[PDB]
Amino acid sequence: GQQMGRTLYDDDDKDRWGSKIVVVGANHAGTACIKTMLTNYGDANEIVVFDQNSNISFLGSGMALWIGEQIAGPEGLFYSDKEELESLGAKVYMESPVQSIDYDAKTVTALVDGKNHVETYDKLIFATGSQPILPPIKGAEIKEGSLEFEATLENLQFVKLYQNSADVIAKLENKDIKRVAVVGAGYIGVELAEAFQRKGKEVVLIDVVDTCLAGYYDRDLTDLMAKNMEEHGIQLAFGETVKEVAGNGKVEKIITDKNEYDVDMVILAVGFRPNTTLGNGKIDLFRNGAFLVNKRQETSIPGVYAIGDCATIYDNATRDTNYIALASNAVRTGIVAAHNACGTDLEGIGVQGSNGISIYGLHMVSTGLTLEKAKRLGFDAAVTEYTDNQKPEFIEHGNFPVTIKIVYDKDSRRILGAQMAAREDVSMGIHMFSLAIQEGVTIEKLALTDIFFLPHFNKPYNYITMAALGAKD
Amino acid sequence: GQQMGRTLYDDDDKDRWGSKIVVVGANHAGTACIKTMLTNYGDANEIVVFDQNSNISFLGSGMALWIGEQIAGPEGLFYSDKEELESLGAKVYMESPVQSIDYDAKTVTALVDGKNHVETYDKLIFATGSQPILPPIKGAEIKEGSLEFEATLENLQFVKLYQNSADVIAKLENKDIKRVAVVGAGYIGVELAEAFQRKGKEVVLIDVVDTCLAGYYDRDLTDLMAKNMEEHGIQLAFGETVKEVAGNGKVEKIITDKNEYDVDMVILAVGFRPNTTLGNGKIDLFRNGAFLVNKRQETSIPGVYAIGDCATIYDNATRDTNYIALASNAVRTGIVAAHNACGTDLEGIGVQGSNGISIYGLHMVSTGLTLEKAKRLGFDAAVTEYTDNQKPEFIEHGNFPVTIKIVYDKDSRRILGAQMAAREDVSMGIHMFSLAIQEGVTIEKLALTDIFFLPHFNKPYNYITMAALGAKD
Numbered sequence: 002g003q004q005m006g007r008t009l010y011d012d013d014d015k016d017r018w019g020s021k022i023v024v025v026g027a028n029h030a031g032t033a034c035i036k037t038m039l040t041n042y043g044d045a046n047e048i049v050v051f052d053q054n055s056n057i058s059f060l061g062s063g064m065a066l067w068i069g070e071q072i073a074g075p076e077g078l079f080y081s082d083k084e085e086l087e088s089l090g091a092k093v094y095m096e097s098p099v100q101s102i103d104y105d106a107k108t109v110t111a112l113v114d115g116k117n118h119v120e121t122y123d124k125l126i127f128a129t130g131s132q133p134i135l136p137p138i139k140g141a142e143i144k145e146g147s148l149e150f151e152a153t154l155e156n157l158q159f160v161k162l163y164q165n166s167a168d169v170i171a172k173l174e175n176k177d178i179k180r181v182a183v184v185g186a187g188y189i190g191v192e193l194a195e196a197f198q199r200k201g202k203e204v205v206l207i208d209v210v211d212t213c214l215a216g217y218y219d220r221d222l223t224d225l226m227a228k229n230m231e232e233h234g235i236q237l238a239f240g241e242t243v244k245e246v247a248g249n250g251k252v253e254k255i256i257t258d259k260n261e262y263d264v265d266m267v268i269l270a271v272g273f274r275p276n277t278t279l280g281n282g283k284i285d286l287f288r289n290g291a292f293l294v295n296k297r298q299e300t301s302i303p304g305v306y307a308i309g310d311c312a313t314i315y316d317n318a319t320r321d322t323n324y325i326a327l328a329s330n331a332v333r334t335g336i337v338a339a340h341n342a343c344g345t346d347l348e349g350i351g352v353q354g355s356n357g358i359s360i361y362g363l364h365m366v367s368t369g370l371t372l373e374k375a376k377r378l379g380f381d382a383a384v385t386e387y388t389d390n391q392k393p394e395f396i397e398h399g400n401f402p403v404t405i406k407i408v409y410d411k412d413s414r415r416i417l418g419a420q421m422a423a424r425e426d427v428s429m430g431i432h433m434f435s436l437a438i439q440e441g442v443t444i445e446k447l448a449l450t451d452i453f454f455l456p457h458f459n460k461p462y463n464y465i466t467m468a469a470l471g472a473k474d
Numbered sequence: 475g476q477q478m479g480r481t482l483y484d485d486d487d488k489d490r491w492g493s494k495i496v497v498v499g500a501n502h503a504g505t506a507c508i509k510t511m512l513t514n515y516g517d518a519n520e521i522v523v524f525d526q527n528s529n530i531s532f533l534g535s536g537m538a539l540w541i542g543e544q545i546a547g548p549e550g551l552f553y554s555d556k557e558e559l560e561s562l563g564a565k566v567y568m569e570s571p572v573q574s575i576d577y578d579a580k581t582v583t584a585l586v587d588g589k590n591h592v593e594t595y596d597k598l599i600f601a602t603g604s605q606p607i608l609p610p611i612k613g614a615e616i617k618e619g620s621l622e623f624e625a626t627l628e629n630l631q632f633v634k635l636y637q638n639s640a641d642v643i644a645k646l647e648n649k650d651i652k653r654v655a656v657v658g659a660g661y662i663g664v665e666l667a668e669a670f671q672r673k674g675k676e677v678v679l680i681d682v683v684d685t686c687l688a689g690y691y692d693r694d695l696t697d698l699m700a701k702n703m704e705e706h707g708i709q710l711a712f713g714e715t716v717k718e719v720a721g722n723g724k725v726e727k728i729i730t731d732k733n734e735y736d737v738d739m740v741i742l743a744v745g746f747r748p749n750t751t752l753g754n755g756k757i758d759l760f761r762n763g764a765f766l767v768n769k770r771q772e773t774s775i776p777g778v779y780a781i782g783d784c785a786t787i788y789d790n791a792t793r794d795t796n797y798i799a800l801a802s803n804a805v806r807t808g809i810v811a812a813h814n815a816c817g818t819d820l821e822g823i824g825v826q827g828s829n830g831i832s833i834y835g836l837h838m839v840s841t842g843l844t845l846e847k848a849k850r851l852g853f854d855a856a857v858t859e860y861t862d863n864q865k866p867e868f869i870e871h872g873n874f875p876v877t878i879k880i881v882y883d884k885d886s887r888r889i890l891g892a893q894m895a896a897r898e899d900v901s902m903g904i905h906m907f908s909l910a911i912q913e914g915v916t917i918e919k920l921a922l923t924d925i926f927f928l929p930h931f932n933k934p935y936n937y938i939t940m941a942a943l944g945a946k947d
């Protein structure tokens with residue numbers, strides 16, 4: 002629940018053509034794009050939407066919370082629906098997959114009620130997102146025909162759509178489900194591990210990489226998180242390649258590189274790939290298939306835009322085109338495309354891949370590049386860190402230690418990334434670093450940056466300042 | 475006590491100069507400056523310090539916490555002392571006021587142990603700070619010659635030095651002190667009002683301005699804080715000029731131009747003014763008497779610097795010279811003056827007057843200009859505000875509303891200030907805006923800034939993004 006009127010971008014419509022705008026996909030990106038277009042230019046344009054799913058505007062980010070019983074039910078996991086979009090002026094086709102696009106005649110063909118539906122367009126917006134990847138695992142295959150990623154082996158699950166989360170939660174009811182294996186230690190696999198453990202199941206987290214949250218946090222924080230999970234009953238099996246998921250009629254064992262585990266359910270959280278096949282090669286693609294787009298979210302074909310997990314985005318930390326699959330980027334890229342497709346020139350500004358994670362009371366946040374990542378990409382990076390209490394030691398209650406890492410370029414001196422971890426929520430602080438990187442602020446300028454002081458809130462020489470002042474080179 | 479090794483600014487000694495450097499004053503500004511010089515350039519320079527007080531390196535910021543018994547006395551309110559500074563390499567003179575400066579023979583004269591002591595210098599750093607403001611009030615006079623702001627009338631108090639607090643606490647135990655009047659409704663007056671209230675005394679907060687926290691927060695938030703204090707029995711008497719403090723040998727009643735109040739003690743917290751008497755008309759001063767300094771904290775007299783509360787500072791919100799008496803600025807100007815004084819070219823970057831306040835569980839933070847203040851300064855400013863919960867509606871516990879205000883220039887579009895209030899600590903969020911104002915970020919660019927999303931921490935359409943998108947002007 003977060004609605005409003007027009008944005009500060011909304012521009013007076015004058016001397017511009019009216020446009021029929023077709024949107025393919027209506028989840029985070031599509032919904033954000035559609036709402037901005039309608040609430041800002043309303044009747045000026047004709048918005049037609051197609052989504053192959055039976056539901057839209059779902060919050061996948063809330064699936065772990067729901068499975069782990071951290072929230073009552075799935076009610077609040079939807080931020081819009083067909084009726085709401087239509088009440089804004091959109092024409093919406095549910096369970097209608099667009100199956101081909103003719104860029105010359107400017108029409109899309111979608112399967113509406115078992116029949117081919119041709120829809121003309123002036124502007125086309127791709128918000129088709131992505132789909133989960135199936136690693137080469139014996140016993141793991143998908144049932145042909147389903148757009149819901151159903152596994153052939155009972156109790157082997159994928160976790161992307163609402164149905165997937167509902168499916169898992171139903172099965173968890175079965176008293177036989179006692180041991181669950183989660184494959185993939187990225188942020189999704191980690192949250193799911195906590196979720197299943199929170200449901201009382203024995204959990205084993207498997208990944209071929211040597212730690213969890215690889216690429217988002219440095220060694221000491223991924224170690225802290227791993228420790229966090231272990232001390233909660235989650236068994237860690239890092240550095241192991243899954244070979245097979247076996248079982249007679251259902252999941253009964255998961256076999257890896259270095260071991261075998263008796264489990265009653267397997268969850269695959271290894272990654273996703275963008276849905277850009279509708280491009281038919283006509284559109285330039287990023288190395289991973291994502292639609293390549295500029296700062297206005299426009300593809301190599303004029304009039305055709307791409308947003309969210311199906312397209313790329315500019316990364317101000319690496320300072321190159323990149324692919325960052327986050328609902329946060331979906332919302333913002335959707336807003337940008339909305340204005341541009343409606344005739345308002347709006348240049349996006351890139352992102353930093355800012356993220357947060359909260360598992361069993363361990364709170365962390367990061368933005369930009371970790372020291373490992375920065376180095377691995379040829380940056381002459383260094384890190385300055387500091388661990389200290391949030392408030393002055395004389396504060397009798399509510400104090401706590403915070404660990405902060407500030408990764409910067411030894412050469413250019415600009416901040417490349419930052420990470421924070423604490424047993425209390427200090428996430429609001431990562432916003433500063435997100436902006437820092439965006440603006441190219443250096444470790445030297447940060448050190449003297451005005452960070453207020455109030456003993457009730459912080460120390461005169463807070464950890465941000467101490468970290469920056471303590472940088473070397 | 476927040477010690478550390480060398481800063482990232484430390485420049486390797488090459489053909490530079492070693493100097494005899496005299497520092498006048500050793501509270502927040504002097505201490506920070508002396509430590510930076512000695513820790514970064516040790517033996518190269520000769521540091522001599524003079525302070526007229528019997529205690530140095532005190533955290534005046536904790537006085538209300540101390541008085542209101544929120545902490546264990548003043549045990550943690552000192553961040554250094556004579557022996558510490560001497561061990562770092564400085565010669566320290568306590569209870570030794572500097573009475574005159576000979577800018578020609580570059581020497582200062584201090585009253586040491588009663589006799590006159592002369593000290594020559596290559597560089598001079600003024601850190602004489604400020605003194606409380608004392609408007610024309612009958613019966614309110616500081617005893618001639620006291621260096622501790624002692625009022626001639628018994629039970630009329632100032633709250634600036636360590637002694638002033640111990641003095642109030644001393645008289646506070648007097649079972650006869652029942653009603654206490656606090657003159658000045660700025661953050662210090664509000665904090666002291668709460669302190670005396672916690673001591674079970676009846677408090678009446680008087681100020682000429684018709685509101686509390688004038689210039690720090692806009693009317694709806696100051697209304698919030700006013701109602702907050704009244705919720706705890708504090709009486710408010712705004713829009714009144716204190717004309718006289720009267721009584722038979724002691725305080726018995728305070729009279730304004732509109733009313734009269736029967737009180738047993740009066741605390742004057744009208745504000746502070748720079749202590750720049752030692753300038754002797756030889757140094758350029760700012761409109762309020764503060765030593766006018768440049769980006770390097772150097773005065774109009776080469777070789778002479780001024781830091782903290784006795785000097786000006788550059789304000790990036792107004793984009794001009796200004797006076798902002800805060801420990802945060804005291805510390806930073808000290809660091810900059812120290813390096814430049816020791817031969818390292820270091821240009822300060824200005825501040826935003828960022829601040830915070832926490833009273834009876836109401837936490838507020840602001841930075842830069844309020845709409846009313848921006849306008850009082852001639853800016854064609856506008857504000858965009860928003861109120862929503864910190865997290866998604868489906869969050870079981872730990873959720874709370876937050877009100878945010880972003881003030882911006884309707885013409886240049888750059889952010890001028892920002893305010894936030896909630897009953898849960900969101901103070902970390904103001905750092906982003908302080909940095910945003912520093913970097914001249916526009917309201918349009920702010921709206922697309924990469925604000926991460928995690929249901930446990932915030933909403934996809936968080937209030938920062940919503941308020942920004944909501945810019946109307």
Ligand SMILES: Cc1cc2nc3c(=O)[nH]c(=O)nc-3n(C[C@H](O)[C@H](O)[C@H](O)COP(=O)(O)OP(=O)(O)OC[C@H]3O[C@@H](n4cnc5c(N)ncnc54)[C@H](O)[C@@H]3O)c2cc1C
Pocket residue numbers: 025026027028029030031051052053054056057060061062063064065097098099100128129130131132160161189276279308309310311326327328329330331926927928929
């Ligand atoms: C468990 C989990 C937790 C997550 N947590 C967070 C988090 O805490 N914070 C964060 O920022 N992000 C999080 N994410 C990521 C976020 O959910 C995605 O980045 C976001 O959903 C992408 O939105 P989208 O609209 O681009 O694409 P998608 O959500 O992939 O949606 C694409 C839509 O288009 C439709 N579609 C596809 N092809 C066609 C077609 N051919 N014709 C018609 N319709 C079509 C699909 O049915 C779908 O509705 C999480 C994801 C998961 C799975």
Ligand SMILES: Cc1cc2nc3c(=O)[nH]c(=O)nc-3n(C[C@H](O)[C@H](O)[C@H](O)COP(=O)(O)OP(=O)(O)OC[C@H]3O[C@@H](n4cnc5c(N)ncnc54)[C@H](O)[C@@H]3O)c2cc1C
Pocket residue numbers: 453454455456498499500501502503504524525526527530533534535536537538570571572573601602603604605633634662749752781782783784799800801802803804
């Ligand atoms: C009740 C209260 C609450 C506050 N709360 C906050 C807060 O929460 N956050 C924040 O950022 N700031 C706060 N402040 C402001 C902060 O305390 C000041 O900004 C800071 O102390 C200024 O440090 P300074 O060294 O520049 O000056 P001062 O503290 O004024 O010290 C100047 C020093 O120089 C000495 N001196 C002066 N003249 C001479 C002389 N002629 N010869 C020799 N020595 C001399 C004095 O004895 C003194 O020790 C608060 C202040 C008060 C009083």
